[PDB]
Design an enzyme around this catalytic site. Structure first.
Site: not given
Ligand SMILES: [K+]
Ligand SMILES: [Mn+2]
Ligand SMILES: O=P(O)(O)OC[C@H]1O[C@](O)(COP(=O)(O)O)[C@@H](O)[C@@H]1O
Ligand SMILES: O=P(O)(O)OC[C@H]1O[C@](O)(COP(=O)(O)O)[C@@H](O)[C@@H]1O
Ligand SMILES: [K+]
Ligand SMILES: [K+]
Ligand SMILES: [Mn+2]
Ligand SMILES: [Mn+2]
Ligand SMILES: [Mn+2]
Lengths: 517, 483, 512, 485
Positions: D60, D107, D225, D283
């Site tokens: 990945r 961010r 996702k 995760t």
């Molecule tokens: K990402």
């Molecule tokens: Mn994410």
């Protein structure tokens, strides 16, 4: 009904469609059926902290007798009972809390490290480390040498074996067995402190002289539950029962399955115990780590079959020792223990030493509520039905009728009267969705039923009415009033009431359908 | 074990069949009611007493023939024979009386080829491309609709056609005669009506109106007899108390090899709705002349019980046959074996999941009582009921334990024979001053009657179902008792 | 799949998640396919003996002709065999529509027959009656064809006569009896003795000559009467000899002992007949359906054919239409899992032999579509043990594949029939079209539910792979001609990797 | 007894639990693929070879960090490590390369209840900066906003849940960018096999990704996702247009309450199993192994329960990107996956999948279920299938057979992409076509037998199921054969 408490998922015809219908916007009820056991330590010892943890959802306080003195634990008991009894002035919201004693058991600890009890030393990977039990080297703990508090250690391990230190973090492989010292080659290095645990995947007795004193202490101070460490066979439980004596015949013995031997002899240990704890901490060192989940699911299933409580313990929310919210793996582990069929979940360092003891309790409470609604009751109840043998005991017969009736109308609660707790336990063993509100006059029974999933104990304090039927109705109303106050019940809800035809335990035989007014 | 218990517990239906044992004797009392048709062979008081002892629960009066006075004698003789056992209340068996309407009948004309029928809309209802006459002997196909009428091309030859029955497959609710017969049934207090030729919901509504407010308590069983009633079955069942699969006329109105499909579909949907279903016609037809039935007839009765039928019927076997008492006994013996051979494990599972969630306390108490009965294999479920509904909600879950229903209503005692598994007991005592003692008395009457009749023994477990206040609709209590 | 296709064959009831919903979805307007899977056995007799009559019953659907050796001489049955074969072979000129017909021999067995010619004596109930061993019959006494009858029956025992219609009770003690049930008594009828252990040999010396006759005339199936134990069938196989080693032996379970020793009988038998006639007299009438359903299920478990016989359509001996009990009895026998259904007097003596065959054909078609295949296949596959035989492994894969696409047929090549029977073992809804060069296999496979045998008559192509494809095509063309197949239908094709029996291992999905 | 056969044969799930045996050893190849995120701890060729041998199947690339040249280096190192085993074709293991898009990130900029956040470019523990210009229309008076992976939170200020040390540039959460388009173009150029599309909220987000891949990225698989509440709500429409799903518990656990993440995980896995499409669980599966050599009990059970739920892939993030034990974390996932795959209640899983799979007239679908049934009937060591695009292998994997699905293919891309399907073990056939097509089919079948024998899959005397087609080209699979080795 509605679209709440995952009811659409509960109405599915297969387990596959059940999963497909689970909804993150379907909210659970306020009743949390899985009990939370919190270990007492420096972070959860003050009366003020314990009051916060009781409000957060802690049902059983665990005292770990591997550390601290009898005087230290008597102070823990006093602080718990002081925090619990500060709520007693309002009986409709009083929450009973059980006290559980966890025995030391057959342990093997290292020696104190040279330089100070609070200094560190490192082991070199692949090096040569000598493990000794010589009394002279007891205070010589260093990088090349470590001492163990177990004399009979040189006559148990073969050449090429393995010795684990510090929760299985350090690994030593036996190369040669020497005269007054065991020559090892380090297989897994790492920092090593003072007086850490040692696992040997034994002739140490099943019940030590110190644990005998610890068990008598628990009887003198009236603990409700004993967690017996490293139970390896049935006679290990009988020895604990015998040390409890006739004084403590009512204390529940929960056997901790901590090694390969305990898993192997599980059936004979379970028949003679009141319940089981899957002690994944030591079990994760005594058998390969990738197999612990097999042992947990096996042990939870056989306890659900037997109708005896099962506790899932250790590292459930470990990262919350230092951080305010858990990882995704930890949240999934608590949810899956509830899904497997665990009756209780435990916190160890999360409440004993961590910086967020109250928040850990709050997180377990929040996860269990969601997971309990996601249980596929339709197949679980059907399988517990067929596996359970036919019974002529009217308490067991009434129990299954009431659970089925509760599923039929999605009852908000089953209200049961019980003195010893047995009527509530027989309802619990069939895993109803409805909360089992148990009204009892026995303070001990009220604490002990926390072991059985889905049972919410209410301690009734009034002297009996003159007509027993009136005394029964007053207790049922006390359960309804408490359920209203705690948010378990609202007007128009349907409730199942379970009673007997005469006073005294053992006569439960009546089930009634009532609507809350 | 007995009652085919190894087979009833099996993990699979295939293993269930494999474990059925001819040497496993039935133990429970038989739960499928027997409906016997009254006729010359079963009209005398002494013969009716024989048939009651043999297991007859419902007497069927066929109003297709006979005058009103003729049927009044039938009712009087049935009631005389039934009441001759009333001297022993603990063993008295109520017997329902059911009125079977003649229904609209299209008959041919009196006095050659190409006849006419009294139904004038026959030209409009039968499109180009079949008409059966006289029990299906003659069959005519139509290939042109003209002003004179139909074409009448002969598909199957036949004879004997003076005022014979006409059936037209593929294509009012109450004649004037049925209105008079239904009035007779109210004035004489019959308990059940078999409404003939029901093909839509408005048909049973018209039967309801003819019964009037004086007959509101009478149960209406809709006879499904043609293709339309089969396709509109859901709307018919909704407004009916029950269903009769009338295989006799059904076997003429639709292809004979399709009747079993209709039977199994209707029994399943009635089981699903918790409403009584009756299977009728030629179950033991050879016994009209012979003392023992054929292998097909014996299999037919057993399979009707296995399908889930609440009642089985005898027609000419008891009305005009030479062995009316033996035909009732044969149905009794077969039903007992068939009920024990029911794969109860999957049946209760499926009925449970299919029954929807309900907040009615009677429905909640019922499923709890049936579950509790299975958990201890209780000898019986004793229930107090005014109208029988509490006993019917228990019967819908097909428990293995007998549902012993104690009632003061003589009519409700007779009517609960429609529900499989319900054994009515008529309580005759006047109410106690205090109501809780009246409840206890009736429960003990059901226990003592159950002990006399072999239902209950000392040491058995029984499930008792009562309510929290007098009047119907308040059932909410289930108790586990030992005898 | 097409929505109109979904409305036939009772597919909505097939997709139901429960048996209850499966019942509720049955539809009388859902028409079945033309291919009936349950085979029809017809007894040959006066009403079904002429070549012209045999032709009409072949077209009506008769698959197995039953010779009842309880009556008639060897010369009688030889002419019956010749007449059947002439009617059968009269269709051989058209290979694509040829219907193979098996010949079955039903043995006499340990029978007991009353006394005689064509007069009729009525018998009063409760009248004292004597049973006679003397070779030296009226309403007060009748004789019987069993000299040792006086040795076995105790006092207070029951004797049955004429399909157990008349019952004698030894009220006192040859045997002086008094009558429990009275009726018109014919000449030389049947006698049954329930409970009493008879010492008659399972294979009489007349039975041995009849079995030799069947081997000499090449019969395909033997119905062995009154099989009570495993060595009853081993005696039958010994009488057949090495010449008759290929004949299928069907054991008739006719009394209480046969039911009690069913498992050991089934192991040494090619199949079972539920002989409800004698069974219904030897055990209570109320229990026959228990025995029938038990034996059908155990045969279905063992994967061996089971026949349901006797009084299925009994009223049709005199009437042109059956009763409602008889039509549901046929349907329920098919729903139970029976491989074959039988007609006795309906075709041997009745006035409507062709109509009785047509009636059984129509009922079987309806009842086959109403089988709840979902649970049947799951339970059969869960109960069958695991197998390393590629024929068994391929069979279950092909049946599962046929359920996935509602395949119109499974076409299998077989020389001995074993590949077809293993497919039939799992009860596909799709017809199993078996293409074979073996005329005997084509006849004997009628025992297996769902198998439609086609006799291939061409010499082999020189490339075997082409020879395999020609037989597959022959199966397709035959199914198209008989209505089983249409353009656009999916078919499953089951073959092997090399010639010779025993190598089946290939399943293919093909569009027609 | 081995590989939990007593547990797998049980009549009830409850009895299946009671029969699980810690001594019953797994004797079957690991079917759940392992995805390892590439980073400083796993860029060297030597470390990648150890991770390939340890069980890594998919590499990945997290485009949330690093420039295009940094990622080209990662791709080159992975391919050099992968191709280092091409000398032995019978043992060559394909490894897929997956591009994980940055997505619409927010961010922070380079304690006390008063705190000001502002998007002003001119703007410690008192003032922090963010990059999202406007947000004043998405948040109502009820919602809140999260900082630093959910550790610091603020309601409608218009400083709840405490909030400790905050660093430079960390995430901001609120319970196709130009950069993402250039990143997807980069992936097409370097021939990546899989795209993980971040923060997929609707079906049109998937169409935008497919459009940015151009007509040259037609063969690239798009895994969506599901990262927030809207992605869960519109899941069905997203699944219909995606090749697969990733349950991104990291962001999901902030966008919805953390206690609800397992509900979303089990819902998506079950629906993906229903639709026959691959689903990835991601995760913090083994987060503690970033710093410690052995995982916690919660982490071990978490990986095992992802497999029991029916996940086709499991993912490692910081454990392999930045941790100190990247190889050991791959070894741990491989070990847990093998144990859990044997503990699956195959009796009910196979039954429920088959009844839920609709009737079909596609010959590939009909052959697949026939082959899986045949495999169960003899405990076939493997199902050997020939495939060009991978579809025939995916149709077998859908029913979760106990037997390994050995997929033989010429397409190097398809070999890498079938790793998304549980139980599919790809082999890359390198020889040129035979003159006669039938001989070229048998030689590929024998290649799968030879490779299976070398790898321990197959053994002389074992039974195998071979799935082929009747003519060249994809879409014609229609033959199932039972063979002996
Ligand atoms: K990402
Ligand atoms: Mn994410
Ligand atoms: O050309 P042959 O000898 O007829 O073989 C063809 C068929 O025989 C088979 O072996 C099947 O025969 P059996 O059913 O008798 O075992 C397969 O190979 C093939 O379908
Ligand atoms: O799984 P896919 O992509 O549909 O490919 C399956 C195809 O592989 C084959 O077995 C071989 O095809 P090729 O010779 O072109 O490689 C075909 O018969 C079949 O249609
Ligand atoms: K301890
Ligand atoms: K015979
Ligand atoms: Mn421990
Ligand atoms: Mn009628
Ligand atoms: Mn016979």
């Amino acid at each position: 009904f509605f679209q709440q408490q995952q009811l659409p998922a509960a109405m599915a015809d297969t387990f596959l469609e059940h999963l497909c219908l689970l909804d993150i916007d379907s909210e659970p009820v306020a009743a949390r059926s899985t009990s939370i056991i919190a270990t007492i330590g420096p972070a959860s010892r003050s009366v003020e902290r314990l009051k916060e943890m009781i409000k957060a959802g802690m049902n059983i306080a665990r005292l770990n007798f591997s550390h601290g003195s009898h005087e230290y634990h008597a102070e823990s008991i006093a602080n718990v009972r002081e925090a619990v009894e500060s709520f007693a002035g309002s009986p409709l919201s009083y929450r009973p809390v059980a006290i559980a004693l966890d025995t030391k058991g057959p342990e093997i600890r290292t020696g104190i490290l040279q330089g100070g009890p609070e200094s560190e030393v490192e082991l070199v990977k692949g090096s040569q480390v000598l493990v000794t039990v010589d009394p002279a080297f007891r205070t010589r703990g260093n990088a090349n040498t470590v001492w163990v508090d177990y004399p009979n250690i040189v006559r148990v391990v073969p050449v090429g074996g393995r010795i684990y230190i510090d929760d299985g973090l350090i690994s030593l492989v036996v190369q040669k067995i020497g005269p007054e010292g065991l020559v090892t080659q380090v297989e897994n290095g790492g920092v090593l402190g003072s007086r850490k645990g040692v696992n040997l995947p034994v002739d140490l007795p099943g019940l030590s002289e110190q644990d005998v004193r610890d068990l008598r202490f628990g009887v003198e101070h009236g603990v409700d539950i004993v967690f017996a460490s490293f139970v390896r066979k049935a006679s290990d439980v009988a020895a604990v029962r015998a040390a409890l004596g006739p004084e403590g015949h009512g204390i529940k013995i929960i056997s901790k399955i901590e090694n390969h031997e305990g898993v192997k002899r599980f059936d004979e240990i379970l028949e003679v115990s009141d319940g089981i704890m899957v002690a994944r901490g030591d079990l994760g060192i005594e058998i390969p780590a990738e197999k612990v989940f097999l042992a947990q699911k096996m042990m939870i299933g056989r306890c659900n079959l037997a109708g005896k409580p099962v506790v899932c313990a250790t590292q459930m929310l470990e990262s919350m020792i230092t951080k305010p919210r858990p990882t995704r793996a930890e949240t999934s582990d608590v949810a899956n223990a509830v899904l497997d069929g665990a009756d209780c979940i435990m916190l160890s360092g999360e409440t004993a030493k961590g910086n967020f003891p109250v928040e850990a309790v709050k997180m377990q409470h929040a996860i269990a509520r969601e997971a309990e609604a996601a249980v596929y009751h339709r197949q679980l109840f059907e399988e517990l039905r067929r596996a359970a043998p036919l019974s002529r005991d009217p308490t067991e017969v009434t129990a299954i009728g009431a659970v089925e009736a509760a599923f039929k109308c999605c009852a908000a609660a089953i209200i049961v009267l019980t003195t010893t707790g047995r009527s509530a336990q027989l309802l619990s063993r069939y895993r109803p969705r409805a909360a089992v509100i148990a009204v009892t006059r026995s303070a001990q029974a009220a604490r002990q039923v926390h072991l059985c999933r889905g049972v919410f104990p209410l301690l009734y304090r009034e002297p009996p009415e003159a007509i027993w039927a009136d005394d029964v109705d007053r207790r049922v109303q006390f359960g309804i009033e408490s359920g209203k106050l705690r948010g378990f019940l609202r007007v128009g809800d349907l409730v199942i009431v379970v009673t007997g035809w005469r006073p005294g335990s053992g006569y439960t035989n009546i089930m009634r359908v009532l609507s809350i007014s």
